[PDB]
UniProtKB/Swiss-Prot annotation:
Effect of G40 to A/H/L/P/R: Complete loss of DNA-binding and transcription activation ability
Functional note: Activator of the Pm promoter, which controls middle genes expression. Activation of Pm allows expression of protein C necessary for late gene expression. In addition to Mor binding, activation of Pm might require the interaction of Mor with the C-terminus of host RNAP subunits RpoA and RpoH.
UniProt keyword Protein biosynthesis present: no
Oligomer and partners: Homodimer.
Entry domain remark: The dimerization domain in the N-terminus and the DNA-binding domain in the C-terminus are connected by a linker containing a beta-strand.
Gene behind the chain: mor
Induction info: This protein is constitively expressed from the Pgem promoter unlike most other early proteins which are expressed under the control of the Pe promoter. Its expression seems to escape repression by repressor protein c and thus could occur throughout latency.
Keywords noted in UniProt: Activator, DNA-binding, Early protein, Host cytoplasm, Transcription, Transcription regulation
Family: Belongs to the c/mor transcriptional regulatory family.
Phenotype when changing G48 to F/W: Partial loss of DNA-binding and transcription activation ability
Principal subcellular localisation of the protein: host cell
A GO CC term assigned to this protein in UniProt: host cell cytoplasm
Name of the protein this chain belongs to: Middle operon regulator
Amino acid sequence: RFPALLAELNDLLRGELSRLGVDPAHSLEIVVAICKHLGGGQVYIPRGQALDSLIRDLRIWNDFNGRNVSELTTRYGVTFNTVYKAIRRMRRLK
DNA sequence: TGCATCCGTGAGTCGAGGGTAATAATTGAGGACGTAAAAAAAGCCGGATTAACCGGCTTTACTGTTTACAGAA
């Protein structure tokens, strides 16, 4: 499982470096670096699901300024309970 | 004892119209009492609203295996 996934990861890293102006071969260093600092065991790579919901609520209350909460339920289709919890959360943070 | 006098009795299934009518006075007063109309309950009726979720994906903690270079007749 490791070889093909590592190869694709290196391909994407070098593509992103080329897009950003960095030399693609520098990606090897990057992956080597992460291969030193990310080991320890077996765990699947996902995303920031907590951060995904965090930025979702961020966008929700950035678009929210009143009645457009209904538009929020029309934006993607979500509950008013989570929207109200997110509003209270944005009130909590300063 | 003969006489009038009175009192039940006497068929049955069926159909189609099925209702008609001699007569008659007005005032006044008084009160009851029904019925609309307009207003409070009051009773839901519409639209947002905070706290109950209970299956399910995603890491940590183990768990029985799966190979090629060092030890024993």
